[PDB]
Point group: C2
Chain length 204, copies 2
């Protein structure tokens, strides 16, 4: 994997954003790992989070004119990603985010090719409606982890977003990266087996 | 003024946040200048803005445990200020913000001495909302930090910042004040007409 992907995994583990064990997802599915970015809740966590998103954006090669953060979780993420692009990649991007009621936008004018940044896709439909109503284009959606598993139907929730809004979704890391990481850790052999078994049953 | 205050004024001028001209405020007053912090609307703007807030906070000497940003405009301000404190001041601070309606909170637990950060303020429903949340959670308000204190009368005899302070016995600090804008305009011949207009406005409305 790329260095920023390895570092993001280690960062998430250290803050217990990423945890391996026996969990139940929103759906009710039994899952061998959990990812919850809410525990990125200090200035240092925010600083690093923005650098990871910024590195994933530059790595993707996608062209975009504006960074959009969905209310509410997307607002700090877009802010720190925009800072990191300016400080560490010499890229000065307009940013924008929505209010859930009234206009309904904060930041730069919503125009051009829009990169949406958010924590996960299991807020997004609401922000997509705003981007379309303003006549802007979707350059992409960047989230932290692509779990690469079926949603309620046969395709993943990410694939459903891609289909419904004709946009590419990219991620900082994927389930494949988690598995590659766990292969290097002998003490995590038990978790690796459980993750591979989960992928066999629910993976796409 | 301190160097970071002069640099903040230069920054606001460069991004058209600070404009000298003819304007009408929300109160109908006719002002010789306007300050619209919403025009700090790019990543580089956000990066620098956080660094100026962080410098004003450290320079204040006020001790605090958590940064709170009121929804919505305070959320990016608290975020970039927290980033700047961690990256440029070796200070790793919890942050928190509210959701406007179902208080409903995002981030670290709301407790300890809270520094509220926003772009501007005024005694009213918005600020009273943030303060009730802070007190409801059993936290202490260490202060409020804003970008510019216009130092002009509200509808009473005190300024909007004094209203917030005197009505709620809290400390408000600012990156710059009207006094600093006047000091910046001095001995710049190309701004002489604006200096006189600002000074005239202050004589009429300044507190």
């Amino acid at each position: 994997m790329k260095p920023y992907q390895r570092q993001f995994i280690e960062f998430a583990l250290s803050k217990q954003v990423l945890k391996f064990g026996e969990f139940t997802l929103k759906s009710g599915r039994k899952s061998p790992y959990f990812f919850n970015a809410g525990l990125f809740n200090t200035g240092r966590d925010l600083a690093l989070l923005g650098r990871f998103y910024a590195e994933a954006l530059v790595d993707s090669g996608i062209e975009f004119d504006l960074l959009f953060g969905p209310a509410y979780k997307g607002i700090p993420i877009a802010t720190t990603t925009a800072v990191a692009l300016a400080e560490h990649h010499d890229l000065d991007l307009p940013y924008c985010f929505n209010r859930k009621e009234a206009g309904n936008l904060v930041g730069s004018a919503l125009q051009g090719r829009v990169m949406l940044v958010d924590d996960v896709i299991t807020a997004i439909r609401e922000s997509m409606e705003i981007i379309q109503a303003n006549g802007a284009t979707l350059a992409g959606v960047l989230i932290s982890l692509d779990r690469q598993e079926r949603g309620r139907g046969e395709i993943s929730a990410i694939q459903e977003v891609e289909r419904d809004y004709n946009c590419k979704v990219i991620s900082i890391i994927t389930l494949k990266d988690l598995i590659a990481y766990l292969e290097e850790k002998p003490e995590m052999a038990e978790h690796l087996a459980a993750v591979k078994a989960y992928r066999e049953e629910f993976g796409v």
